[PDB]
Each structure stands twice: as C-alpha cells, then as structure tokens.
Write a structure and sequence with these properties.
The structure is cut from a larger assembly and holds seven protein chains of seven kinds.
Chain E (H helix, E strand, L loop, with lengths): L17 H11 L3 H8 L4 H8 L5 H5 L4
Helix pairs in contact in E: 1-2
Chain F lengths: L18 E6 L5 E7 L3 H13 L3 E7 L7 E8 L5 H27 L3
Antiparallel strand pairs in F: 1-2, 2-4, 3-4
Helix pairs in contact in F: 1-2
Chain G lengths: L31 H6 L11 H7 L1
Classes of the chains: A mainly beta, B alpha+beta, C alpha+beta, D little secondary structure, E mainly alpha, F alpha+beta, G mainly alpha.
Bound molecules: zinc ion (ZN) (3 copies).
One zinc ion binds next to loops of chain C.
PDB class: transcription
Keywords: Rna polymerase II, transcription initiation, promoter opening, transcription
Entry title: Structure of a yeast closed complex (core CC1)
Chain lengths: ~45, ~80, ~260, ~50, ~60, ~110, ~55
C-alpha cells in the first residue's frame, strides 16, 4: 500500500489498491499523494 | 546545332554564373579525387584548389551556351577571359 | 616614494580613506580587486528534507544562498576541487543545518542564528552567522505557522564573487578623485551656469579651487584618490584591503612566475 | 545597447532580480471505451509492454 | 516577498532591518524617510527595496496546508 | 542552457598556459603576449607600467571578446632590449608598490 | 501553395536575433545547441581524413 492524505481533514489514509478513491471519515474524494521520503539536492546559484 | 568557331557571337567574358558553376563543379570533382593540374601550395579546401586552377586556366571544361532558338556554342574556359 | 593612506572615517561597516600617489591604474585595479577578487564563504548546496512552507524549495535555497557567513580563517580551508577526497571533508567545507517548527498560534520566525555548527572547525573561526542587528536576531529567512516543519542541511563552500554574487564581502565602494575640476576630465553640462547647478562634493574641503585667471592645466596627472570601503559583515575592512593587495600581488607575482618559466 | 538593447547587471541577477517561477500542469485521464478495454495507471514493465 | 535578502545593487544586508523598520513605524509613528534614515540606509538603491516591497507571504500563510 | 560555467572565468583550462609569447612581424622588435583568464584589471595595470618606462616604444592591450577571459598585450621596445625584461621590471615595481601600500596601510591602521 | 511553391523544410533554425558589434559584417553568431543539433555531410578525402577521424 501507499500513503495518501485527505483533502480537507488531512488525515493519513494509506489505502491499498481496489479501494476506489474516497477518504475514510469524510467524503472528500481528493486524495493527496504526499511528498517523497528521500532527500533532494539543490544549488543556491 | 553547334555554331562554328568563326560564327560565335556571344560575350567572350566569363560571367559570374559561369565562374560560379565552374568553381562548384570543379571543386566537387576535386573533392571526389580528381587529377589536379596545378601544384598545391599546401591547400586542403577543395574550393581554394578550384580557384587556384581557375587563376591559371588549368580547368579542363568547355561551356555549352544555349541560344534561345535551340542552338548552342562551345566556349572553353581556357579561352574565356576571366574578370 | 609610494602610496600614502590617510583614514578619514573608521567604523564597523564603512571606512573612508584617501589613497594618493597612485597611478589611476593601481587605484582602479585596487577597487576592482576589492570588489571581485576576494574569497568568501557562502552556502553552495542546500539539501531539503521536509518542506511544508508556502514558499518554493529553490526559492528558500536562493535566500539561504544570499545569507552571509563568517570568513576569517578561510585562507587555510582548501577548495573543493583541490582536495583529493570524494565529495567533501573537514578540509574543504563547513556543514550546517536548520530545523524549524511552528509552536504556538503566533507565527514563528526562522532566523540565521538558528543554524548550528555540527562540523569540526580544527581551530578555525568560520561558520558563525554574522549578527549585526540591534535586537540580537539574525536574518529573517522565513515564517512558519503551527503544523509546518522545515529541516535542511546546507554545505557552506569557499568561493569568490566571480562564481556567484553571494561571495561578495565588500559593498558600495565610494571612488572619487579631483574634487575641483582642474584635470579637465569632465565637461559639465549647464542650462545657465555650471557653478549654480552642480553642487560641491565633500572632498572639496581637503583641497582648494584652482582659481580663475590662472594658466591652463595639461601637465598635472590624476592622483589623490578618495576611497570609501564598506564591508557587509564577513571580514573587517582591514582584511578586505590587505587581502585585496595580497591578491593583486599574488596575481602579478603569478604573471612574473609565468614569464620566468618561458 | 543599440536598437532597443539592454545591458543587465549580472550580480543583480544572481541576487534574484526578475527571477520568476513557471508551473506547468500535465493532466492525464484513464478511459474505458466499451468496458472491455480499460486504461490503467501503472508502472509499465520493459518485458511485456 | 518575505523581506528580500541583501540588496539588488550595493549588497548590504537589509533583512534584519524590516522588524525594526515596522517597529519604528508602529511605535514611534515616524515617516518612511525618517525610519530609513534611522536604519542606516544612505543610498536609494537600498531604499527602493524596503520602500517598494510588497510582502505577500502574510496573505499566503492564511491558507490551511 | 548554453552559457559557460562561472568558475571558467578565472580557472585555467587543460592543455593551456598562462602566457602565450608570439613574435609579431608588423614592426621590428615587436611581440604579442596572449593573457588567459584575465581582463582589463591586469592589462591596464601592466600597460601603465609599460608606458612609464623609456625603453618601450609601443605598448597596448585589448580584450577581443567579452565572452572569453583573455586579452592581448602588444609590446614593442627599442633595438637591443627585450620586452620581457620590461615586463619583469613592471611586475617588480607593482609588487614593490603593493608591498609598500600594505605596510603603510597596516602602519596607519595601527594608529586608529 | 503549401506543398509545391512552398513547404516546411529541414536543416533550419529559428530564434531571436540580437546585436554584437565585436562581430564582422558577414558573420553570424550561432548558439552551441543549434550547432550540435544541425549537421552537414562532408565527403571523406585524404586532405581531411585525420580531422574527420578526430571528429569520429
Ligand atoms: Zn478526510
Ligand atoms: Zn575534501
Ligand atoms: Zn542598495
């Protein structure tokens, strides 16, 4: 499974496949993908 | 039908188009390993060699100037006065 | 003999002095070296872990890149390309980090003093955020509310201003010469009169007008320079001037060494 | 500077002058023609695709 | 936005002058030129930064993440 | 995109040198010295000291293009004298004046 | 009009032009990306076999 975040209440869902697209506890179908857990290198120039 | 040499009444001067196509075709032949008739001064570019042959009239070509009535003339580039 | 320096104003940021007996080439070369060919320490690489701010990531990396740092004992810190290690080591760069998190309802402000030094200095005095505010607070990097974290690791590397403008210790350099126009280098434009429109400069107090009715000037050279150096906060003014003169001397000596080998 | 040309300071550019952000949005959607063929968002394998 | 670091010309650090600037404006009720004269800015290259700044981060923070 | 790296403005490239001494045939006893990874800061400062000498007949410099860190220094001295010696005297004079400027600057700084 | 008298052709580049007094009258400054994108077929001759070999 992959970690997802709800639109409004911003709760951690982490639903798997074949579970459609819908938040638990609220009916907001907008689910975030969350940012990667690895580091990203940048340059100040 | 090939006008004879005593009846050639065209301009004896080589035009810029004739010089251009003579240098282009001659340089194209030199690029394709053609026998060079002039001793090189260390050149590598084919166009410079073609102009070197034109400066000494060593280019072995003859121009077939087409007349508007269907006839033509044969003016060799060696007898054509350049510039 | 050679040049003479007469300091007029000496402060923590601005220092105005008079550098005379110097051909225009050595004065212009001096100010050009002080503006450009002087080393500095600034952030070169920004590694962002978590960022919930409303600002962009590379935007925050740019703001962090513009932040000045201390750069005193930078002479004995080798360059990144000069060191034979992979990436970095305690010989080339200084490692910094920042962790900010909003606590109460009022917004928390992230200052440059929040940066801590987690790398060994081996007796050096670099990496400390320069604090020049009267309230004791560093540079306001960004603002954060409750529920937003910001953790990052910066790699402060050595470089001159030719690589990027963030390595600029000097600021506005006031260059002036010949207060009363006698060398005839500028023809002042005037609508009615040049003496009533153009005001007098400060340095005019240190000389005198050439007096009207006198013979024309054509044998006098350009000298008696007025140079005001201003440092941002990295190194003091004496290290700017001394490091600049030693920089130009190492360049000219490098050209002499480049000519000797021929 | 001739012909409406401008010279800009490089040190001012390095300090963030007229620097802007560009946001490009790529919208994709899976569809079903006659229910028998169904497009699916997935990571394609280089063996069977 | 959110206080430009350094300046876009001279290069002097100004980010640490915003909090004081507003503090001098909301407490002493001085003018803009007087406050900029108290911060230490003597060139208009810096003055255009603080004088023409449009802080939009405050309107950005009012959104819930 | 296509702009060169910034550190290339002062770092010497591979297979290159600092000075390129090339004899010139435009005038007798004339030489053109090519300077790499430098600009007007060194060219004008060297040219001034070359003009302060009496053995140098001609001395100039120019930057061919601003996108390349390089400048040409054309020198022409009198017969029986080498321009390299004049350049050495120029470098020694600059080093001496900079040393006196540093010593005098520190001496005047210790009085504040 | 769109297929005989005129047509869209290859071996071309379009971009913004600007001035440069340091260049000559007949020259034109071409960017490096355009120089690496476009190409020209040269014929191998004993005069440039070493140069073209270096290019390979
Ligand atoms: Zn929810
Ligand atoms: Zn290292
Ligand atoms: Zn300014």
């Amino acid at each position: 499974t992959l970690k997802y975040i709800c639109a409004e209440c911003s709760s951690k869902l982490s639903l798997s496949r074949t579970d459609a697209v819908r938040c638990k506890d609220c009916g907001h179908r907008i689910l975030l993908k969350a940012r990667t857990k690895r580091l990203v290198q940048f340059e100040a120039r | 039908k090939a006008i004879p040499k005593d009846q050639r009444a065209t301009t004896p001067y080589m035009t810029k188009y004739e010089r251009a196509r003579i240098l282009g075709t001659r340089a194209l032949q030199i690029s394709m390993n053609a026998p060079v008739f002039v001793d090189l001064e260390g050149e590598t570019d084919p166009l410079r060699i073609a102009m070197k042959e034109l400066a000494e009239k060593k280019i072995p070509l003859v121009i077939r100037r087409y007349l508007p009535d269907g006839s033509f003339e044969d003016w060799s580039v060696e007898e054509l006065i350049v510039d | 003999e050679g040049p003479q320096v007469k300091i007029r104003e000496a402060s923590k940021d601005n220092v105005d002095f008079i550098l005379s007996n110097v051909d225009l080439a050595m004065a212009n070369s001096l100010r050009r070296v002080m503006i450009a060919e002087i080393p500095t320490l600034a952030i070169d690489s920004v590694e962002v872990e978590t960022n919930t701010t409303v600002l962009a990531d590379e935007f925050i990396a740019h703001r962090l890149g513009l932040i000045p740092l201390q750069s005193m004992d930078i002479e004995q810190l080798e360059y990144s390309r000069d060191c034979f290690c992979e990436d970095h080591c305690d010989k080339c760069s200084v490692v910094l980090t920042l962790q900010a998190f909003g606590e109460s309802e009022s917004t928390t402000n992230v200052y440059s003093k929040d940066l801590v030094i987690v790398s060994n200095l081996m007796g050096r005095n670099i990496g400390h955020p320069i604090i020049q505010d009267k309230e004791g607070n560093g540079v306001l990097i960004c603002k954060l509310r409750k529920g937003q974290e910001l953790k990052l690791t910066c790699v402060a590397k050595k470089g001159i201003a030719k690589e990027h403008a963030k390595w600029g210790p000097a600021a506005a350099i006031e260059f002036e010469y010949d207060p009363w126009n006698k060398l005839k280098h500028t023809d002042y434009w005037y609508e009615q009169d040049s003496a009533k429109e153009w005001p007098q400069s400060k340095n005019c107090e240190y000389e005198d007008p050439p007096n009207e009715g006198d013979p024309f000037d054509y044998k006098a050279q350009a000298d008696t320079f007025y140079m005001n150096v201003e440092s941002v906060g990295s190194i003091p003014v004496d290290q700017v001037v001394v490091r600049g003169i030693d920089t130009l001397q190492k360049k000219v000596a490098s050209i002499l060494l480049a000519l000797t080998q021929m | 500077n001739q012909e409406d040309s401008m010279i800009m300071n490089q040190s001012s550019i390095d300090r963030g002058l007229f620097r802007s952000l560009f946001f490009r949005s790529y919208m994709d959607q899976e569809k079903k023609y006659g229910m028998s063929i169904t497009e699916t968002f997935e990571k394609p394998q280089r063996t069977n695709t | 936005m959110i206080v430009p670091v350094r300046c876009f010309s001279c290069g002097k650090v100004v980010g640490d002058k915003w909090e004081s600037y507003l503090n001098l404006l909301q407490e002493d009720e001085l003018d803009e030129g007087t406050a900029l004269s108290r911060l230490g800015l003597k060139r208009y290259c810096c003055r255009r930064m603080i004088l023409t700044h449009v802080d939009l981060i405050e309107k950005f923070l009012r959104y819930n993440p | 995109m296509n702009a060169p790296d910034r550190f290339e403005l002062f770092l010497l490239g591979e297979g290159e040198s600092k000075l390129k001494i090339d004899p010139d045939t435009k005038a007798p006893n004339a030489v053109v010295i090519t300077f790499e990874k430098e600009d007007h800061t060194l060219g004008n400062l060297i040219r001034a000291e070359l003009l302060n000498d009496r053995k140098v007949l001609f001395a100039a410099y120019k930057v061919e293009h601003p996108f390349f860190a390089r400048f040409k220094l054309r020198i022409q001295t009198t017969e029986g004298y080498d321009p390299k010696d004049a350049l050495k005297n120029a470098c020694n004079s600059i080093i001496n004046k900079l040393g006196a400027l540093k010593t005098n600057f520190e001496t005047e700084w210790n009085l504040q | 009009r769109g297929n005989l008298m005129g047509k869209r052709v290859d071996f071309s580049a379009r971009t913004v032009i600007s001035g440069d007094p340091n260049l000559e009258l007949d020259q034109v400054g071409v960017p490096k990306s355009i120089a690496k994108t476009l190409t020209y077929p040269e014929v191998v001759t004993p005069y440039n076999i070493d140069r073209l070999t270096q290019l390979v």
